[PDB]
Paper text:
The crystal structure of A3A (E72A/C171A) in complex with ssDNA was determined by molecular replacement at 2.2 Å resolution. E72A inactivates the enzyme permitting the formation of stable complexes and C171A increases solubility. A 15-mer DNA oligonucleotide that binds A3A with ∼60 nM affinity with a target deoxycytidine (5′-TTTTTTTCTTTTTTT-3′) was co-crystallized with A3A. The target deoxycytidine (dC0) and flanking deoxythymidines (dT−1 and dT1), as well as one additional deoxyribose at 5′-end and one phosphate at 3′-end, were well ordered in the electron density (5′-sugar-dT−1-dC0-dT1-phosphate-3′). The central cytidine (dC0) and the preceding thymidine (dT−1) are accommodated in a deep groove formed by Loops 1,3,5 and 7 of A3A. The bound DNA adopts an irregular conformation to encircle the side chain of H29. Compared to apo A3A, there are conformational changes in the rotamers of the side chains of R28 and H29 in Loop 1, and Y132 in Loop 7, accompanied by more subtle reorganization of N57–A72 in loop 3. The deoxycytidine (dC0), which is the target of deamination reaction, is well coordinated and buried within the active site of A3A. As expected for a catalytic A3 domain, electron density that fits a zinc ion was observed coordinating H70, C101, C106 as well as additional density that fits a Cl− ion, with both assignments confirmed by anomalous difference calculations. The structure explains this strong conservation, as N57 of A3A is central in recognizing ssDNA with three key distinct interactions: The side chain of N57 determines the 5′–3′ directionality of ssDNA binding by forming a hydrogen bond to O3′ atom of dC0, which helps stabilize the geometry of the DNA backbone and the sugar in a C2′-endo conformation and induces a backbone deformation due to steric hindrance with O5′ of the target dC0.
Apolipoprotein B messenger RNA-editing enzyme, catalytic polypeptide-like (APOBEC3) proteins are single-stranded DNA (ssDNA) deoxycytidine deaminases that are among some of the fastest evolving proteins in the human genome. APOBEC3s catalyse a cytidine (C) to uridine (U) zinc-dependent deamination reaction. APOBEC3A (A3A) is a single-domain enzyme with the highest catalytic activity among the human APOBEC3 proteins. All APOBEC3 domains contain a HAEx28Cx2-4C zinc binding motif.
Numbering used by the authors: 10 to 196
Amino acid sequence: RHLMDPHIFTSNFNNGIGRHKTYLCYEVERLDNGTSVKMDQHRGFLHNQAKNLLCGFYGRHAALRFLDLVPSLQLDPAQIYRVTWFISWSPCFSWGCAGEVRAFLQENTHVRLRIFAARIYDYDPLYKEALQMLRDAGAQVSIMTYDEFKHCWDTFVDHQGAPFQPWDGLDEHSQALSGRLRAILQN
DNA sequence: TTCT
Ligand SMILES: [Ca+2]
Ligand SMILES: [Cl-]
Ligand SMILES: [Zn+2]
């Protein structure tokens, strides 16, 4: 119920405009006797801790800051939950995050993970290996489409009554990215 | 204007 600023959302989740930051919206649902129950109190968003060598802050990618906060969610380890991420950059490999998320999932088997990425972080030369590894660890790895952008707008942004207005090129970029990811996950 |  801490809501994201409209301009922060549109300037970070635009799937044609890269930024030097990462934002991550998350939601948790519990699977019970077949159907799924939304746990609206476990909803939130965060961004990465920025690098700042000067001030001796080393910097922490958004995905690991989500892992940081899981204990506070107080999940029942006998139950099974689906955690959904809407992340403005896909997770990296070379800084260790994909592997850390895999280790978290192996240990925390009560969490299943669904990732929708706005953009592919191919700045990481080994970004393909992060995506395949997350898939191999049991996560759903997907590209955000209109439905997820609107859902994040409706759910996480302080819109004040304004309906989601898709930017130019939202569908074209989502489709192109969905094509690249599918090819990556075919292998 | 790619977790600067
Ligand atoms: Ca959805
Ligand atoms: Cl990452
Ligand atoms: Zn990372």
